[model samples]
Target: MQIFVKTTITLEVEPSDTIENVKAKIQDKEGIPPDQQRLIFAGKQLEDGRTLSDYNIQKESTLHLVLRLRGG
Candidate 1:
């Protein structure tokens, strides 16, 4: 039931990471602009107003990034 190419990358962070934190990381590291991203996990999208811990992001797992082009 899988038919997708791997365009996803890995993000390393401690438990201190939040949704906004990751967006900042991406904008800083990847320079993709935090305003252009949406985090994906557990078959749902993440809200920047929450923390990673509350999302059940265990010891370590995968998080997908969704990029949107806007404000052009």
Candidate 2:
């Protein structure tokens, strides 16, 4: 499956992610370790190791993830 982000860049991922695994793709693209990343969508926060099956995301689903910002 492929995910189109911001209507430009597209990522290759497993369709198991409801047609586009944005979370996994983002982790791969941003180079952020999976353990340190947090996934937010549909007014909910998803824990690591959770898949679209858990959320019941259907095919052609468009999900977004907002990376948390932190500073010292």
Candidate 3:
């Protein structure tokens, strides 16, 4: 099953989904590359290697998505 939330856009994800997985989904939905995605939940940044379950994410939980900045 998947859960969806609205951030910069709406993203659908699973409780067992890793940050990496969510990033990929975001990339597909919003055209943001996984490397450029930064996901935040519960006032903390989500680690790519961790699962949503690790952060105790529940259905309808909201996540903030930010794009990474690059400089020359």
Candidate 4:
């Protein structure tokens, strides 16, 4: 299945992808560390311990990845 982000980036993922995997995918796309990424899905933070299936994700699921930036 493919995840649509902000109606712009369509990330290719598998149905078995868990929340943690989504984090990794976001990190890879944003060039950030897994621990540094914060993603909100369905109005809740995506916990690593939970799987996408646990969130009732189906084909063409829409997820929003909120990228964080550091200000010095």
Candidate 5:
């Protein structure tokens, strides 16, 4: 798994892992809160309740992070 940055960090994760869980790990690594994280996969934005399996995500899949959505 990965998210775009200067160089996107490749995260090793599981198909059973939920989108929310990944966001939490991303917060740990990137200092961005889960509320401010959006995961893009297969050209579709991922939702928090779903697992990677729900999106057919597997090894070395690309997930894009489009951080924080609105005015601060």
Candidate 6:
């Protein structure tokens, strides 16, 4: 499993998962939408077309999840 950090919360994800897949899981667990998710790793925003492996994501790696604000 991969680890993600958002504020004071920690999330677990799969290493073979894509950014979009993780966002969907987050939506189920946190009531956030895939479109609203902003996943950051190594200070770069993750793209939906990429898999965690493409980003070299490993077990216990910490990613950051931000909620995108609409109508700002």
- lDDT (tens digit, per residue) of candidate 6 on 1-72: 747666335557766887888788877878877888788889898999888899998877777777778322
**lDDT of all predictions, in order shown?**
0.65, 0.52, 0.76, 0.71, 0.76, 0.77
Q: Write one digit per residue (lDDT tens) for candidate 3, span 1-54.
A: 445544546656778888899888887888878887777888888998899999
Q: Provide TM-scores for the models.
A: 0.72, 0.50, 0.81, 0.72, 0.82, 0.80
* Candidate 1: stretches off by over 4 Å: 1-7, 70-72
Candidate 4 ranges with C-alpha deviation above 4 Å: 68-72
Total clashing residue pairs per candidate?
Answer: 0, 0, 0, 0, 0, 0
Tell how far residue 65 is off in model 6, in angstroms: 1.3
Write model 2 residue lDDT over 22-61, tens digit each, in one string.
5556657766555444555455666655666676545454
TM-score of 4: 0.72
**Top of the candidates by TM-score:** 5
The TM-score of candidate 3 is: 0.81
lDDT of 4 at 62: 77
TM-score of 5: 0.82
1 against 5, candidate with superior TM-score: 5
lDDT of 3 at 31: 81
Per-residue alpha-carbon lDDT of candidate 1 for residues 1-72, written as tens digits (9 for 90 to 100):
111111254566656577898778766767777787867777778898887777777555677776766321
**Candidate 6 residue pairs that clash:** none
Q: Say which candidate scores most in lDDT.
A: 6
Give the alpha carbon lDDT tens digit for every residue of 1-72 in model 4: 887765146777876788778777866786667776666667776788888888777778777666556411
Candidate ranking under lDDT, highest first, comes to 6, 3, 5, 4, 1, 2
Winner on lDDT between 1 and 2 is 1
Candidate 3 stretches greater than 4 Å from native: 1-8, 70-72
Sum up the clashes in candidate 5.
0
Local error of candidate 6 at 12, Å? 4.2
